[PDB]
Amino acid sequence: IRLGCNVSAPSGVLERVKELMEDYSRAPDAKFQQQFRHLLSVNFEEFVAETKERNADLDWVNPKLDERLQLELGQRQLEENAKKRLEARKKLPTMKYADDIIQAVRENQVILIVGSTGCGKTTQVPQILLDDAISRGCASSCRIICTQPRRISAIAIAEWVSYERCESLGNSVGYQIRLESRKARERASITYCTTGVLLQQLQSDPLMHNLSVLILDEIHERSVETDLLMGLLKVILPHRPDLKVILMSATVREQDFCDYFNNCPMFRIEGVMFPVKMLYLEDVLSKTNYEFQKRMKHEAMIEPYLRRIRNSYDSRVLDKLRLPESEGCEDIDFIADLVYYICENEPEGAILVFLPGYDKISQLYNILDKPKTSKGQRWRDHMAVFPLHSLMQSGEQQAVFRRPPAGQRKVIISTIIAETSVTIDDVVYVINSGRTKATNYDIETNIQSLDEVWVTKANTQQRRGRAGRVRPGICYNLFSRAREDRMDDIPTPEILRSKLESIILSLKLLHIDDPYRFLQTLINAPNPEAIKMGVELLKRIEALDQTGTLTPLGMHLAKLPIDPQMGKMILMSALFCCLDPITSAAAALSFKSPFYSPLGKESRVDEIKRRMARNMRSDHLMVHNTIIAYRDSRYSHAERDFCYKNFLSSMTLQQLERMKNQFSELLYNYKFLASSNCKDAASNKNSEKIPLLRAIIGAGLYPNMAHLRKSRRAIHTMATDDGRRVNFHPSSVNSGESGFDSAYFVYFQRQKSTDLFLLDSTMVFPMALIIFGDGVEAGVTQNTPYLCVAKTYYFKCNRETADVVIQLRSNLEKLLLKKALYPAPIEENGYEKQLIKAIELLLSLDERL
DNA sequence: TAGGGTTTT
Secondary structure, three states: OEEEEEEEOOHHHHHHHHHHHHHHOOOOOOHHHHHHHHHHHHOOOHHHHHHHHHOHHOOOHHHHHHHHHHHHHHHOOOOOOOOHHHHHOOHHHHHHHHHHHHHHHHHEEEEEEOOOOOOOOOHHHHHHHHHHHHHOOOOHEEEEEEEEEOOOHHHHHHHHHHHHHHOOOOOOOOEOOOOOEEEEOOOEEEEEEEEHHHHOOOOOOOOOOOOOEEEOOOHHHHHHHHHHHHHHHHHHHHHHOOEEEEEEEEOOHHHHHEEEEOOOEOEEEEEOOOOEEOOOHHHHHHHHOOOOOOOOHHHHHHHHHHOOHHHHHHHHHHHHHOOOHOOOOOOOHHHHHHHHHHHOOOOOEEEEEEEOOOHHHHHHHHHHHHOOHHHHHHHHEEEEEEEEEOOOOOOOOOOOOOOOOOOOOEEEEHHHHHHHOOOOOOEEEEEOOEEEEEEEEEOOEEEEEEEEEEEOOHHHHHHOOOOOOOEEEEEEEEOOHHHHHOOOOOOOHHHHHHOOOOHHHHHOOOOOHHHHHHHOOOOOOOOOOHHHHHHHHHHHHHEEEEOOEEEEEHHHHOOOOOOHHHHHHHHHHHHHHOOOHOOOOOHHOOOOOOOOOOOHHHHHHHHHHHOOOOOEEEEEHHHHHHHHHHHHHHHOOOHHHHHHHOOHHHHHHHHHHHHHHHHHHHHHHHHOOOOOOOOOOOHHOOOHHHHHHHHHHHHOOOOOOEEEEEEOOOOOOOOOOOOOOOEEOOOOOOOOOOOOOOOOEEOEEEEEEEEEEEEEOEEEEEHHHHOOOOOOOOOEEOOOEEEEEEEEEEEEEOOOOOOOOOHHHHHHHHHHHHHHHOOOOOOHHHOHHHHHHHHHHHHHOOOOO
16 A cells, blocks of 8 residues: 555644534424425325326316417418418428328327428428317317427427418427527427427426427437437326327338337328439549558458449459558548549539548648648639538538638538538538547446447438438448448447436436336346446435435435536535536536637647636636636627637537526525525635635545656656546646646546546545545554545545544534435524534645645 | 537426
């Protein structure tokens, strides 16, 4: 055993702590307590009964409202506002199956509608059902919820259906995404919402008694949420016979979902796109005649293939397929040539290039921007080149989607962001690398990695679709048909990659107490060892006890829309009066960071983050300081110049502020804060005490610790608590820095790409880990007295301080158990404040002088 | 010295 720095406290400080704890130890209405015990006493039968009396609103119908929307509908279908709209609707393929669909929903509880894009299933199926209920005289019985995976889609689709119905948004159709809603009228209505909104509303209505029809869309994408939702539909619908659900899918393994719902009726609706011709690597080379020069395991794939096409291609075209670099995007000069080829031949239209990630977008941007070849210098002035990437600004401006200036052709260099998330309408040509990046969590080594991999057949068909929204397009795939043959059908469904602590906790609020049982029933059941790992984390942070039952703390965490570790950090900041900086750290880690990474400016972005960090050695507090500067930028009417000079996204910052207010308002509702305003003076009496903020951050990120050992920009010898050598990710503020006041760090995410990096980190102090961690014991090892945390990191510590810290931890354990069970703000002049002050005192010993 | 992409009453 190695022994770290001494953490013993002075006599005078220890005496004040003993007095504070002894004043805390002379202390003698809980709606929450009653609800927590009620959840733990009832079995599932009682819980289904009890939720059916409490959610009874749609037992009530209004016949005069029914009668008036019926008559109003019949005559507004004689106006010429509509009836232009209505015959333009009838040109969508879905509307010819209108009556077959109405009849199928009436006769069956679950149906499935399969259709390619342009078929109108999302637009039309909700209104076919809605207008049928209104026509039949049953308007007020009808409440239609239709889920979508992405926030942008729920809005645009709702604004479209509202237009198709000659209404301002909010009367018959509405949308609800998180922290923004234009709600439809209460009854006879269609609401589009993200799947996550629906999932949060089960906590209050777990058997879906507040809607009459549920439509799940784009389920073939196998997001965690809709895969989760279908699992719970098999629990709910045996108890909701009147509820109608309509599954909706693209033609991507349609049959899986039909199989799941044992064999339900399945419609196939034709689509509307223009033909997109597909070329593979052998076809591109025979048209570009490009030549390369500056493992294998390749040959066994390509040489059989080269014999079955031998008479369909020139022999020299086939010999380039023998090169492993011809495949994918290993040679960017070859992608630049195919861009140059489309510019000379092959008439008007924008080019959409899919490359895996930032590094290879940067490469092809620079070859087209500052060409080395004369062929490319030819074309530099006649291309308007746009990189597209979720950390780049181009998506949140308006030029990437408008048509290019006269005499210039648009070239978009994009990651998979342009497959579904972002949409460009005048694209005619797609260059499909066939390579993207994916995250791989390995249960065996607990190493999450970011690897470049081949795309799936579902992927390439989506990319080919992006070429046929305007004209017949062309799609070039930079890989052979032999490579396509060995591609997977779909990407790994993401629930097999995710960690489950958040889901397991959410299930216990739906009275699904065994997660091994229920998770085994999804389409793709996760590794039961991942569940074991999720449960052990939830046991560690004490959201479940050691028999696995929900604790009072765990019930509050389950009700916060944020991963449960960061949920805990937010509660802590409510009881330790540092709420505004800590909810900033939490929001940013759950959402993304507000900094762009524009091309060519990486070293300048490094300076900005270094300056916003104010030398506090933490990526988390850096964000909070960025947010403090953004508010001052707005108070100053200098917001756009501030965002310009610092490479920050206004819209991300404005979203992080809506999230911090959501957290404080939730905490105010749960009786943990006196005020809902997260910048309130009383909730932030300690918000400037930097050592205390590292303590609360660590209380959330624990047990993700790392210890630093050497120096030299600088070279770091560092390792996580488990012994693996790590480094800070170069995008982190602590990469390469020299002279840390402490050698210990906490982190949210470890990731291997070129090395094992920490993507974010805060420098932390040993006494903070001791107070808020576990695995704390006192003893002697060489002949010196120690005190340790996680039984991993051992610190020299006198026996007077170790006696006080152990007794201080035991009172902190008791205080948290009380505030979870009987929520109230900590009163500024009471017994519980005395314990808090004891902790403020100890941690303050580590401020930089 | 490096950053696939969604999303939460």
